[PDB]
Design a protein around this ligand. Structure first.
Ligand SMILES: NC(=O)C1=CN([C@@H]2O[C@H](COP(=O)(O)OP(=O)(O)OC[C@H]3O[C@@H](n4cnc5c(N)ncnc54)[C@H](OP(=O)(O)O)[C@@H]3O)[C@@H](O)[C@H]2O)C=CC1
Ligand SMILES: NC(=O)C1=CN([C@@H]2O[C@H](COP(=O)(O)OP(=O)(O)OC[C@H]3O[C@@H](n4cnc5c(N)ncnc54)[C@H](OP(=O)(O)O)[C@@H]3O)[C@@H](O)[C@H]2O)C=CC1
Ligand SMILES: NC(=O)C1=CN([C@@H]2O[C@H](COP(=O)(O)OP(=O)(O)OC[C@H]3O[C@@H](n4cnc5c(N)ncnc54)[C@H](OP(=O)(O)O)[C@@H]3O)[C@@H](O)[C@H]2O)C=CC1
Ligand SMILES: NC(=O)C1=CN([C@@H]2O[C@H](COP(=O)(O)OP(=O)(O)OC[C@H]3O[C@@H](n4cnc5c(N)ncnc54)[C@H](OP(=O)(O)O)[C@@H]3O)[C@@H](O)[C@H]2O)C=CC1
Ligand SMILES: C=C(CC/C=C/C=C/C[C@H](C)CC(=O)C[C@@H](O)CNC(=O)[C@H](C)[C@@H](C)OC(N)=O)C[C@@H](C)C/C(C)=C/C(=O)O
Ligand SMILES: C=C(CC/C=C/C=C/C[C@H](C)CC(=O)C[C@@H](O)CNC(=O)[C@H](C)[C@@H](C)OC(N)=O)C[C@@H](C)C/C(C)=C/C(=O)O
Ligand SMILES: C=C(CC/C=C/C=C/C[C@H](C)CC(=O)C[C@@H](O)CNC(=O)[C@H](C)[C@@H](C)OC(N)=O)C[C@@H](C)C/C(C)=C/C(=O)O
Ligand SMILES: C=C(CC/C=C/C=C/C[C@H](C)CC(=O)C[C@@H](O)CNC(=O)[C@H](C)[C@@H](C)OC(N)=O)C[C@@H](C)C/C(C)=C/C(=O)O
Lengths: 259, 260, 258, 260
């Protein structure tokens, strides 16, 4: 049609809020301000308590929360079947889910366990494939799926180890989904976020060193936050990004472009 | 109070490279207009000025500000931007939609390309962005956003693109080096890689209809794109929606870049 | 001194199954350059074929070891045993991949969790564990090479789950290169163009892809197992010193065009 | 009888861009010499001819064939290659090790770059390969291999590379478009992306010792590369060992391209 960022009459599933620092919460704040109906997903019960507390910050009249552990085909198939009944058809999904064992992230990459490797692949990459298959059922008119990645999918970064191979997998997942679901007018894209202080990120060594290197070396000489990812998520989830699919947008102050 | 906003009132954007209603830059203009931006326009030929004045009737621009700039001339570019600074004041960004090569060099085997045809393509299609950026910077002391238009032929050897492929590769590196230079001045530099669109430049190149049909057949979205889709992405990149994005190349091409 | 004389060099070659195997192309080439070759196989059908094929080579002593890369034990034990039988090695050529035909025909979005993680296990993780063990036999340094396809870099029709496995493999190579670089171990990939092999025979319209290469690729021709072998020789020898984390396309220039 | 062979007897290679003993192209020459190849050399300045004659004593080249070619001149390039065709006959490939930009443009902020400095860098550092390829093709009716030398700054914005980064991006696209054009004539075109090396061109740029130290600290192999390592990879790419490889860019840089 034309260029509009008015997301009234739009419904978006947002997977992977855990606390106020979660990137997916940044996405939620932004989509909320633009007047979208938001469905939320969580794994742990601690995340449900946090979500209910955080909905007070939003202008969401009715809370729709669904527990989905992406490790379970059943929790994913049932979760999306249930969303279809409770809220009906949706316009897109924001995927903000990743995990690896701290054991495998400290080790030399060559020491990585078969279990730690396939675990990282399962949660951080395959989750997008099954989520896409199910969400498709609620998007007969078309829609937009967005996953969150890191530069470590494209380059060997110190300490990212097994998560780098998971993100490389995720980034190829996005391309293959984009080619598969394109004929159904479903767009699939990734956001490569710069480093952000979150629940997942807190408790890895010298994370403050990486934040300082970005401020020093990145073109914009600053770090990014959850809302900047949110703004780009709005572009990719809305029809502003029509004709964009299989794309990876770096929201990282230009760090990807330098060496 | 809105964090994420596409409200471009109180924003001024220079748009270089409108020639007719089919121009990609016109798609950009229609979109930025609808979002309530003040638009300055640039043209080379007089045919383009006549067309621009006729087309402003389609827009909600109260005052027409047109400036003749041939990007081959340091003086026309330096003077044009000095004049825009006086007439409209400080700007928030520039959309660059300018390219040219001799049809001679685009038909030939790439190895037959003339030194003159090669350096001409570089001058208009790549260096133009460097000098435009240097001058526009003077009108963006608070920061801003520069966007150039490229094609997948900058990244891969495509049949018949020849000398323009090497110009676009040059443009795409230009964007990265400008992004690194002007980043500390809070100026973002990015490119849009547009899929094929029927325009004045594109009409009269061989079997262009073959390329449009291959996109519809092989590209993920099984369809071609238009000037407005480029316009929408231009709005994202020129607005503060794209804050934290610089040195980036967004493919608006129905996913064609992602497949093989 | 620039030399392709591989006397006094020993190379493990994983993934020979028949005479059409890419790894066999690698073996023929390394043999002609006078290298001692250790071989690995999974199925017994592959052992029978290997013994028959060693007659075509100038290998005095046959060293065959059964390793299924799905098993930590078969991989750890296989490489411990190679260390005893032949001693220290100079590199490993990895030519191993697998996915369920089920998942390769389906729309990629239909892919099963089992089919996906299986492809990752054999086609990508195998390189990580192989590298960990082979390192033990390369205290002076060495070269590891894995085989990939352009489908790791771009979505190609019908490659589906194997594309995501190859994307994983190609990142594996980069992360191994960064980890084992300080131990003077180089890790690189060869992106082979399409070749008629046992694995490749019986997948839909493979003859369409071979014809598109001959028509559209810069060299207007397909490649064979030996061309991969020649590039494998470069990457496994010290000719490629200073090259690590690299992906060489042996594909008639197809990767460079669109 | 050897499928895989690095025996370059009965092979003739033109090597453009030796200036002194530290030149990358000299590393290429030493390696190709040891493998028993007939080597033709090219130079611009007379200082380079004196140095070349002195350096031929280090090689096992029976007959010295030196030709002055300034790649800025179509005539010097067309005539030089016509003359090589008469003196030595048909060749098997060309190693291109030629680049230049004004020190003025390499110190400045990239946005300050002059139109003259930009197009000069493009002319010598990129177009030179196109015209050299067109002429050398005439001496390679059976096929052959052309190799150009590039730097990571063609792919990423690196501090201080400025206008040479845009030239190398141009060169790297040149290689792809030449590979597609000359492939049917069985001519392969590839690039080597060398890590940083102490040479005549490189000496006298600021904090070059900082970049060498960052490579030793951060690159996978925790060491820098030299002219011979580039030479070894040049041997692979120029010989038939690299058959089926064209439009490729091999990083000889201790793995630095693969990390971030
Ligand atoms: N923070 C950063 O610097 C960057 C992050 N990213 C990516 O952004 C995404 C989110 O990161 P961030 O916001 O830091 O992470 P958070 O720690 O805030 O959120 C992680 C989320 O993952 C969810 N999760 C983990 N396992 C599962 C599972 N099996 N099923 C469902 N949900 C699960 C968690 O839910 P619960 O805790 O309830 O399981 C949690 O909500 C990730 O994909 C990450 O790779 C990318 C670049 C940078
Ligand atoms: N159409 C397509 O399929 C694609 C186009 N592109 C790129 O999009 C951009 C514009 O193309 P498109 O809109 O189709 O073409 P148009 O024919 O609509 O526009 C070309 C424009 O370039 C201007 N121009 C040319 N030379 C100069 C100069 N020396 N100084 C100032 N202006 C000049 C022309 O002005 P005048 O008429 O006054 O000379 C004209 O307005 C180019 O960068 C092109 O490479 C990228 C991908 C696809
Ligand atoms: N053929 C082609 O066109 C191309 C192939 N490639 C890649 O080249 C490599 C070799 O394939 P190619 O030579 O065609 O196929 P082959 O049929 O020759 O080989 C498949 C090989 O993988 C081995 N293998 C499979 N599973 C396991 C396992 N669990 N443990 C150990 N070995 C295993 C097989 O052994 P067994 O059968 O005895 O189990 C067999 O040797 C693959 O990585 C492939 O993706 C890349 C580009 C093109
Ligand atoms: N050194 C490094 O750190 C790296 C260098 N490279 C590349 O390697 C190549 C050579 O580098 P390096 O060893 O440093 O170079 P050298 O300084 O040793 O040689 C530079 C050469 O360029 C030649 N040249 C310049 N202009 C012309 C012209 N108009 N016509 C003919 N020849 C000309 C010079 O000839 P004369 O002096 O006779 O004018 C000289 O032979 C370049 O392409 C460079 O970009 C790539 C990565 C790293
Ligand atoms: C180079 C780095 C620093 C090392 C970072 C490793 C992070 C990897 C990704 C995941 C998110 C970390 C992870 O698996 C967390 C757990 O091991 C421990 N924490 C938890 O379990 C908490 C309770 C939950 C909520 O976490 C999850 N995921 O469930 C990368 C950084 C520069 C950038 C970065 C941090 C990228 C990224 O997140 O992918
Ligand atoms: C692979 C292709 C197909 C071949 C098309 C090559 C087009 C290259 C673009 C240049 C800019 C065309 C060009 O310079 C045309 C002029 O020589 C003649 N036309 C004019 O002068 C008219 C009057 C004016 C208005 O035109 C200009 N430019 O001033 C590429 C296509 C599939 C995609 C494409 C068309 C890309 C692109 O535009 O860059
Ligand atoms: C686009 C294509 C065409 C579709 C090709 C799919 C091939 C994927 C490769 C995997 C490895 C094939 C595979 O796993 C098939 C098995 O399910 C059954 N085959 C076997 O079991 C045979 C007997 C054994 C030897 O197989 C194995 N692996 O053990 C890709 C092509 C253009 C290029 C190509 C064929 C690339 C590649 O091999 O990866
Ligand atoms: C990131 C960097 C540091 C910035 C320096 C870049 C230098 C690039 C080389 C260019 C070609 C310098 C140049 O144009 C030379 C002249 O301006 C001055 N020198 C000469 O005139 C001598 C006498 C002659 C023989 O040289 C020439 N061109 O003829 C780059 C480094 C990390 C790596 C590097 C320097 C790469 C490279 O060579 O491109």
């Amino acid at each position: 049609h034309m260029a509009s960022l008015n997301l009234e009459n739009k419904t978006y599933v947002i997977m992977g809020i855990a606390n106020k620092r979660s990137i997916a919460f940044g996405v939620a704040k932004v989509l909320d301000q633009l007047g979208a109906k938001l469905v939320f997903t969580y794994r742990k019960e601690r995340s449900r308590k946090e979500l209910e507390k955080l909905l007070e910050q939003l202008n969401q009249p009715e809370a729709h929360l669904y527990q989905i552990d992406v490790q379970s085909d059943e929790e994913v198939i049932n979760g999306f079947e249930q969303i279809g009944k409770d809220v009906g058809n949706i316009d897109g999904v924001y995927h903000s889910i990743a995990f690896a064992n701290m054991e495998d992230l400290r080790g030399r990459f060559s020491e990585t366990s078969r279990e730690g490797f396939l675990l990282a692949q399962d949660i951080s990459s395959y989750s997008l494939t099954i989520v896409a298959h199910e969400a498709k059922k609620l998007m007969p008119e078309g829609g937009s799926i967005v996953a969150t990645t890191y530069l470590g999918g494209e380059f060997a970064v110190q300490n990212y180890n097994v998560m780098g191979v998971a993100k490389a997998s995720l980034e190829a997942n996005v391309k293959y989904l984009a080619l598969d679901l394109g004929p159904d007018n479903i767009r699939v894209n990734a956001i490569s976020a710069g480093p952000i202080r979150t629940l997942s990120a807190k408790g890895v060594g010298g994370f403050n060193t990486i934040l300082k290197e970005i401020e020093e070396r990145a073109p914009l000489k600053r770090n990014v936050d959850q809302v900047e990812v949110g703004k780009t998520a709005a572009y990719l989830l809305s029809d502003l990004s029509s004709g964009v699919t299989g794309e990876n947008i770096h929201v990282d102050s230009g760090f990807h472009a330098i060496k």
